Amino acid sequence: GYVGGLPKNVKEKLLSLKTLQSELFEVEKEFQVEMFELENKFLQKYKPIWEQRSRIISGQEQPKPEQIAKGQEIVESLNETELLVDEEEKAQNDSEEEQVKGIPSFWLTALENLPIVCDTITDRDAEVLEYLQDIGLEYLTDGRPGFKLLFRFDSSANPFFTNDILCKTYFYQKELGYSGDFIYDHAEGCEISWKDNAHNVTVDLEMRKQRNKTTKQVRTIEKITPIESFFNFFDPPKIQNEDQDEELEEDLEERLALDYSIGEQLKDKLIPRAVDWFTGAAL
Amino acid sequence: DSGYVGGLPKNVKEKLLSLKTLQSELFEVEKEFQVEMFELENKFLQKYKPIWEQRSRIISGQEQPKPEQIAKGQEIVESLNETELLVDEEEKAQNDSEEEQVKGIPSFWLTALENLPIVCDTITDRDAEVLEYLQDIGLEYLTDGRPGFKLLFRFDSSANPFFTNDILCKTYFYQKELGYSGDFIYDHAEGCEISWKDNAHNVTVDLEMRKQRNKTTKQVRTIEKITPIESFFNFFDPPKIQNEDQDEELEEDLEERLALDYSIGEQLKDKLIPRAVDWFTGAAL
């Protein structure tokens, strides 16, 4: 205030500082573009590792002796001696071992250990998550900057929906939010092609067969009511803000905070750290 | 669950070991990514250097704004709300001879630090007295030698009465390996020895003097005593370790002092200097 009340030398110097602030903001925009470029570059390196562990998880690929030995040495260095093999386990025959190809409930176990997301999982969700093979992540290059999430389900054996893959998208605002980070814009996601309502874990179901007391027509009914589930992660909050959504926008904002927290958790912890979160060592 | 872990078939344990190996490879990739980020950040620090130097010249009064920069600032003021800078008729009547009697921006950096939440707690009035002579706050990235960043504080020896050092700097150091989350993690920090002009001006100590005809020792003797005290300039001379005392005393020392010190260093580096102006006016809050 008084700095404005100070002579126009001080005001004019502040004006120059603000012009330099705008120029610095331009340099900052350049830096942000550069760091997203670098992040994409190294995400291309992340993807092979994540896909490899996903193939191991689903059982689509097998380990190798050198990898097992390296993990042995690392675990001994980690002090997490629980993973260590014992002779009683060695006694198991191959016929006993191959009864399951992938790690049972790998992701479900990992998501159960993960702090916030585990609260979202219901029993039917847990059963569904058993068919979850992989979680993949991607960055949005066009238009608004943002990052996208992918899940792969073995839809062939999945009894609940035909969606081979589900994708979830996040958006950021146009300009650099203050403090030189990117702040969120609303999110969008897929809709699930449930095979039927009984198998729809986002829904609880009622069956009714009736003869209408008013018209005396004969009818059989299939009825639906939505419920909370891990897959409420999809059907994300509709819009950041719009005139018709305001009453919805209350829930959209709250669920947006929660869903951004969930996605941030996935992005930083789970997809970059899966093994420890499965084993619980990440706790 | 230990029981479930035991239940894991030997094949499943082998697969888990392979997965942990993959996680280690991921940590290696994260190391490479952090190296690239550090180098790019150094490059854009080089690009920031001109603008920061120019604003420093403006702050010190060594340079005067041009009408072009003035008009651009006026436009940016018309944007959002900064009409505090819109110059009024009463000021245009003034003359540079009257205005330039105060050259530069009084207490620009001291004001900037005080608005900064965490660090301002450490600054005392005795520290503050030095900070009016602060006219620059600079960053350096320790590309050579141990990784980390160094902070630079500048003064005028001919102006300040406290020390003969034109520049005071603080340093922070990282471990050779990344943290678990993939971010950088810390090593012991170090600070400069302040070349105080005299102990009386020195602000990291409180002193007392006595004189005794000590019959207990039959000594006509003069004595001096020095006590460390709390002050922001304790931000320099950070803690160090000695093995035996380390595990009892410096364990808690490292638990507390290092946490506060790293928090303050990162807060300066990230929040303050890139927004050196908004923090001074307070808009950066």
Numbering used by the authors:
A (entry chain E): 83 to 365
B (entry chain D): 81 to 365
Reproduce the article's own wording on this structure:
The importin Kap114 transports H2A-H2B into the yeast nucleus, where RanGTP facilitates histone release. H2A and H2B contain disordered N- and C-terminal tails and central alpha helices that fold together into the globular H2A-H2B histone-fold domain, with very basic surfaces that bind DNA in the nucleosome. These same surfaces are shielded when H2A-H2B binds the Sc Nap1 dimer (Nap12), which is mostly localized to the yeast cytoplasm where it chaperones newly synthesized and folded H2A-H2B. The mode of H2A-H2B recognition by Kap114/IMP9 is well understood: the superhelical Kap114 wraps around the H2A-H2B histone-fold domain, occluding the histone’s DNA-binding surfaces and functioning as a histone chaperone. Here, biochemical and structural analyses show that Kap114, H2A-H2B, and a Nap1 dimer (Nap12) associate in the absence and presence of RanGTP to form equimolar complexes.
Nap1 alone is a mixture of dimers and tetramers, while Nap1 binds H2A-H2B to form a mixture of a Nap1 dimer (Nap12) bound to one H2A-H2B (Nap12•H2A-H2B) and larger Nap1/H2A-H2B assemblies. For comparison, we also performed cryo-EM analysis with a mixture of Kap114, Nap12, and excess H2A-H2B without RanGTP, which produced a heterogenous mixture of particles that included unliganded Nap12, the binary Kap114•H2A-H2B complex, and small populations of two different assemblies containing Kap114, Nap12, and H2A-H2B.
